[PDB]
Structures are given as structure tokens and as C-alpha cells.
């Protein structure tokens with residue numbers, strides 16, 4: 001809807017930064033829609049990924065990083081706070097030791113930094129969703 005998907009935005013992250021994403025799945029969970037959020041080191045899609053967050057609605061969540069063109073140790077979670085056919089609010093906060101992911105205001109996943117957050121230069125949100133809001137908090141030094 002509001003914003004185009006794939007959605008790409010140049011960004012700068014550091015401790016205290018928050019990325020808020022608002023959207024909804026394009027189809028019911030039965031058809032297994034996906035949602036993917038990648039924090040890139042460069043403005044290009046082929047660049048490395050500091051934090052890869054992929055949701056298979058109703059199934060699982062996978063997190064990883066792509067370093068020097070290679071995927072690393074994948075982390076899998078079965079925690080599924082997302083609701084079928086519902087708008088969701090996803091917020092990713094940058095803590096000193098890791099990323100904390102909140103879904104609709106509830107802590108749901110964390111991922112220890114593998115690469116310093118300062119290496120991020122772009123964020124891309126894509127797959128099967130309509131995007132209504134994308135915001136990066138630049139209120140701290």
C-alpha cells in the first residue's frame with residue numbers, strides 16, 4: 001500500500017537506535033507468506049548482511065548474517081506472536097550486546113551482534129507484505 005515493496009532506505013544505526021516497521025501479510029497464514037528484513041553494509045542488495053530477519057508466518061523465524069558473501073550460523077525460533085490477517089508493529093532496537101525484536105509491543109527475539117551495528121548503511125524490507133510505515137530513530141548521538 002503506502003510504501004513500495006521491496007522497500008529500501010539508507011540508514012545509520014548505533015546503540016539506542018530503533019527501527020519500527022508497520023505492515024500486514026498479503027495472504028492468509030495457510031498459504032505461508034514471508035516477511036524479510038535485512039540490514040546491509042552497503043546500498044546494494046548483494047552487499048553483506050549484518051542482521052537477516054526472515055519470518056515464515058505461522059511457521060518459524062530464521063535469523064542469520066551474510067558475511068563476505070557467505071551465510072553464517074543460522075538461528076531458528078518457533079516463537080510466533082504474529083496474528084493471521086492482522087496488521088503488525090515490528091520494532092528492532094539496537095542494544096549494546098544485541099538486537100531486541102518486539103512484535104506488537106512484546107519482546108519476541110534477540111540476536112547477538114556479529115558485526116558492529118555501525119557497519120549498517122541500508123535496510124531492506126520485502127517479501128509478502130504491504131508496508132504502511134517505516135521509521136528509524138535518529139534521536140541519540
Ligand SMILES: OC[C@H]1O[C@H](O)[C@@H](O)[C@@H](O)[C@@H]1O
Nearest residue numbers: 054062063064071073074075
Ligand atoms: O534465511 C534464509 C537464509 O539464511 C539462513 O540462515 C542460511 O542458512 C542461508 O543459507 C539461507 O539462504
